[PDB]
Amino acid sequence: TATLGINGFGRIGRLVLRACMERNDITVVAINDPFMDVEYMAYLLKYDSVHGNFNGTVEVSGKDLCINGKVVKVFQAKDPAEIPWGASGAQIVCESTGVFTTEEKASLHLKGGAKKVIISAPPKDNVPMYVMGVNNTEYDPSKFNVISNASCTTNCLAPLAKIINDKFGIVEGLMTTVHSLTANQLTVDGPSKGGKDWRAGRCAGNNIIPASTGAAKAVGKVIPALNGKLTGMAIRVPTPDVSVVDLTCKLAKPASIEEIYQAVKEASNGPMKGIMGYTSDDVVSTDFIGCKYSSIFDKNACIALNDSFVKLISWYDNESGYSNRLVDLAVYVASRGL
Amino acid sequence: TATLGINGFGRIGRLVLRACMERNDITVVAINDPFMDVEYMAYLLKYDSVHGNFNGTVEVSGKDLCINGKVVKVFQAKDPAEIPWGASGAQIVCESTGVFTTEEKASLHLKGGAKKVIISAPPKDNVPMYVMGVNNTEYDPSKFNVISNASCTTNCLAPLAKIINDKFGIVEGLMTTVHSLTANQLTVDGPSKGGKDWRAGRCAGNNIIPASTGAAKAVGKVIPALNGKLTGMAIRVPTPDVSVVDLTCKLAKPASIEEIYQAVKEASNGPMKGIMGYTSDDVVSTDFIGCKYSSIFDKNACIALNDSFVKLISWYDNESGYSNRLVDLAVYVASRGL
Amino acid sequence: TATLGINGFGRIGRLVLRACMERNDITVVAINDPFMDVEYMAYLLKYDSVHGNFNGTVEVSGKDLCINGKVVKVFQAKDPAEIPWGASGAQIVCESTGVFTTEEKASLHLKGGAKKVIISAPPKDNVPMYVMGVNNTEYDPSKFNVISNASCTTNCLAPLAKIINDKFGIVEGLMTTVHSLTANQLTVDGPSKGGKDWRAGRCAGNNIIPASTGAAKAVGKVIPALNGKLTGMAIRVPTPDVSVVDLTCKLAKPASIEEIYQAVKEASNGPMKGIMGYTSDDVVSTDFIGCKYSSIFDKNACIALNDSFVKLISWYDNESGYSNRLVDLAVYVASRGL
Amino acid sequence: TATLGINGFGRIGRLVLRACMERNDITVVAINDPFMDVEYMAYLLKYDSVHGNFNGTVEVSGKDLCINGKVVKVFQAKDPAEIPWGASGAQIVCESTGVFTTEEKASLHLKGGAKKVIISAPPKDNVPMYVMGVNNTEYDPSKFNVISNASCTTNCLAPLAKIINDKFGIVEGLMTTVHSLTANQLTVDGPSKGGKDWRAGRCAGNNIIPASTGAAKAVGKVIPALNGKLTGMAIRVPTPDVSVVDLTCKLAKPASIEEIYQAVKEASNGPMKGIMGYTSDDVVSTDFIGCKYSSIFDKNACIALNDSFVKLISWYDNESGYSNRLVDLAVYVASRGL
């Protein structure tokens, strides 16, 4: 049974813990976050403005947390090397602070005794990215101690792109993701951290905000065959959670929406079960809150100009789907020997 | 000077009036709306959650309105034929009820003394559509008494599509328009008007909602050369006003974003002055509230996969841009003889 | 087991059905709504932006619905007297259309064979109002066949006022309820249904909107001793669900927030179990979505100027609390003999 | 002509500058904000998600700004003592960083050459607070070099309380302010800066959030006669700007809503012109965006239980009203002798 330690108990960090609490093949044993006292952590875990009250019990036991009768050690270290993961028995660390996305920084968790590290975001350097159901079996435990679970958008696009490319072939594609807001955004017009993404610093509650994303490009690394064939952008909107991918692509072989739908269905019911999903109902974003799939094809919203040029629509709970995939990755990593 | 009569004093009708009050080449002489007393009409004109207080004075004078010292006759006819446009001195009628989108119905305004009628939406029949700066000069007064100003989305896409197709040639394109809130969506999950668009009946305040749009095809009627080369859809988000068009297309001639940008700029400073606009700043939706342009190219938001496959982003205040275009068309129609 | 018929399959009608599906002492056997196709009814029950997916199975069976393998008859009678409640086996009717709020109209259901009717709103005439945990045992089956479950605001305020008045005595009080959005409001500035409340017709998504409410005075009828001692108003804000009562009162007997808290605690763990609740945590509105309590005291939000002038804060999921109470009342009504 | 220097170019700092640009008796000569490049500053002044595009011109000149022709020196000092106010010719400094709310920290501006300092918030120590139209004439230049313009909420309540206390006398009162969000709140559930106000760290876009505020008590300092007679709390909501005060008070002398209205009317058209305002229209929050009044009485929203127990409703653009008052205070200070 793999043990997990969480650094950065934020949106992703807390949902990863919630996912672990629902499984018997992985146990959370420690959490670190310098911006939260143990009482604050208990509070943020218990209540969620999007996913409801925690399904179980949360209590402070001395300096630590007692979640569902299990003891979870708490730390407040500003630097990863200062967290006693080993002494705590944490084998794999979910690096979800958003501030240590390189091998150099993320590897600091190793000094602390961790055996493996999973960055909950695409890396800034060459750390390998894996997407469950697409290329995770490529992971080599003898070569990597620090890996990446990519982004929420890449986890939505990769599985779909794989299915389409395998069956029909993607000549070229452009993507736009209408994405719900994130912690990086601001409630009122203000300066963005580091003064880089100016648009991201504009009132999140009343603006449609164009944004950059490397998700489409990253798919070209997770699926080499698609290198240089995809690129995209993002549009941030006021909703608290759930996003949607709009993939416009030219196919190498003709395909109707019905045929694309059938290909997605065969994949979802077989090799990508639990990862790729689909629907034919008149859904809207809130219907996916809490959905654990990485990508859900919206049949009725897809459109096609002709048999080779189509626009595919796929939903994803950027918080829930991604967190469950990170947990799946952690379990997979454990199964391959730490 | 042309005199205008407004049927349906809704979001569009009211903005059209506000636009006229600012111009000397056109005067609003009458308003008709059976769903609101004169007192309520005055209230709706003086206060607006998106465009602010009315710039001027608004008084109730008997059964009519005194706006900026001018008399505006008010009527509560339910049937377009019962409205005394001629007696009021109304030459052109702005048909903005959204219920008379056919020449048969819309033509009823002529039985009241009105000479011309402009439907503030795409017609359900064969009524000709005109987009200012694109095909309005094709209008012939001796052949049509009832015309259409198309839709807000069409007025944003058509200008852009024309510049791009003229300069580089559009082989095929797919559009997605992210729309702000409209008068059809619901505040809470409830029955849709007609029980046809189920998604549109879902809570608009906390949902991303896929929707249909005929704009892409309408552009194929406004610009015959693009007939059958475009199609699209919409995605509604919880913002009060301002929308954006995401146009993904394959070009005939290779073109960089810089060149596309330069081409828009030339048209914007020339044959489409006041219609086509452009920006290179990190703008967000709220920056366009009140903007009178039909379409505003967002240079930094555009992205290109190759020199022949690009995604263009263009903003448009779905209310202000469109309304001002309808008044421009009214003025144009009058300049051609009634 | 008591059987329920639902007239008006709106927000309340649907949640009433969801509430019944979880209980074994009451079953919905029929639904009537002439402005909603069964296919759409199935859709609205299956999906909800606020309460999530329906916990169970909903299928269209001919012209009726099959819910959890049970046939629920569906009608389209615009006139209550035309609904075959009796033939359908419906004993008690949940009148939730919002248009038959008088004894004259509501009693038409009796012509259809129903034995009792519960109006899901305060009546326009003198139909008796009952609030579970407050005055429902005053219901006399031999004298009334038509009753009212009052309003969501009243169900929140009445239990709290009863506790405070019983223990300390309320000399006089003023209430303000901050309400989350409801169907009544509009997504954009426009005419209100009836043209009475101009403010209510303003854009609900970006406005704080003052409004009227008779809940404070209704409490004076539900609790006679408080007649003439309470009055109040409402303030609508752009949040999807869950509201809060802000009660400012002068007490006849001195009391600290701690003692008021204990009094509420006693009631909540005693005579008002499942009706009145309480919390000492730093909660926010979303933490109550789905909560079945009628009123939840927020200890930390309460404030006192002195020992006899206090401001008490109580939360309520205006949809979930109210609906579960209506069902409780239906079960209570049946237990008293039909 | 008074000169102004601004430290903390945030919501208030930028609106203070905007207010100045519209006046001929005061000029901004310098701005300091370490989290903004001169280009970023130009951008944030040029665009505003709530108050629209800047009315005038803004260009980067070397390392400074050129606003409407006037040159404005730009600094990036994190430590107040390091800002060369004196050399820049800035006489009065607007301390709007939100982090230097004490005489000790704020007075550090004097070391740079500034002559007077105004903290744009209530102080954490004994720095005197002044509310234009209420007690600003009690200012004494020979006594203080550092003063406070109190809070936005206090500027709304103080004028109203003074009028009511002067005319009828306030026995006791409890206040609740429904407040739009601020920069302190978060877009998604997270840890509040400092680990204090936990509720303030909950998703701002979809929650009704109770909060503390010393504004009511502060009124007791600005109006000694009211010390110990008022207190209150706040309720934060998703709107970007504009707030409303709900004052429930017991009057020493009986008074009707009409009489209270007349008293505010007299004050508004007399001693408090430009400060206290009133309305009898069906207004909503957006109608006050850009309003320069400190407090606007909503006659129709007020309600009374008796002749001595009333609930008064008063609006205020927390950003615009306050900023203009701060500028009014700066001019008043200059007129007293620097």
Ligand SMILES: NC(=O)c1ccc[n+]([C@@H]2O[C@H](COP(=O)([O-])OP(=O)(O)OC[C@H]3O[C@@H](n4cnc5c(N)ncnc54)[C@H](O)[C@@H]3O)[C@@H](O)[C@H]2O)c1
């Ligand atoms: N929000 C999403 O839907 C989503 C989806 C996929 C991936 N991600 C990625 O996951 C990461 C976290 O995202 P999030 O949305 O949960 O952000 P968040 O802001 O909600 O949480 C980040 C946490 O990091 C903590 N933190 C900051 N510095 C720290 C330090 N030195 N040590 C330990 N903790 C520290 C913060 O206190 C916070 O609790 C980011 O890299 C993000 O891009 C986010």
Ligand SMILES: NC(=O)c1ccc[n+]([C@@H]2O[C@H](COP(=O)([O-])OP(=O)(O)OC[C@H]3O[C@@H](n4cnc5c(N)ncnc54)[C@H](O)[C@@H]3O)[C@@H](O)[C@H]2O)c1
């Ligand atoms: N909202 C937009 O941004 C936008 C943009 C482009 C085009 N349009 C089109 O413009 C039209 C109006 O849109 P809107 O958003 O202003 O709608 P709206 O709901 O705000 O107003 C419609 C008005 O029609 C009135 N009406 C109904 N029957 C009438 C009758 N018989 N005579 C006179 N008035 C009558 C209503 O009382 C109402 O005031 C629609 O056809 C719409 O599709 C809207």
Ligand SMILES: NC(=O)c1ccc[n+]([C@@H]2O[C@H](COP(=O)([O-])OP(=O)(O)OC[C@H]3O[C@@H](n4cnc5c(N)ncnc54)[C@H](O)[C@@H]3O)[C@@H](O)[C@H]2O)c1
């Ligand atoms: N929304 C709340 O949180 C809440 C809380 C307490 C009380 N209430 C009250 O409950 C009632 C219903 O509220 P709601 O939000 O569900 O309304 P709603 O607008 O969501 O639904 C009303 C339903 O009435 C139906 N209807 C109209 N005429 C009908 C007829 N002749 N026969 C059958 N159905 C008919 C409509 O088709 C619709 O489905 C109202 O009186 C309301 O004031 C609502």
Ligand SMILES: NC(=O)c1ccc[n+]([C@@H]2O[C@H](COP(=O)([O-])OP(=O)(O)OC[C@H]3O[C@@H](n4cnc5c(N)ncnc54)[C@H](O)[C@@H]3O)[C@@H](O)[C@H]2O)c1
């Ligand atoms: N927002 C309101 O409606 C309102 C109303 C009344 C009073 N106030 C008070 O005004 C102050 C500012 O409020 P705001 O909403 O504009 O905040 P804000 O977050 O919008 O702006 C604060 C600015 O301070 C800057 N800053 C931080 N440290 C600095 C430093 N060392 N030197 C110079 N600048 C620095 C930030 O970069 C930012 O631009 C606070 O004290 C607040 O409580 C705000």
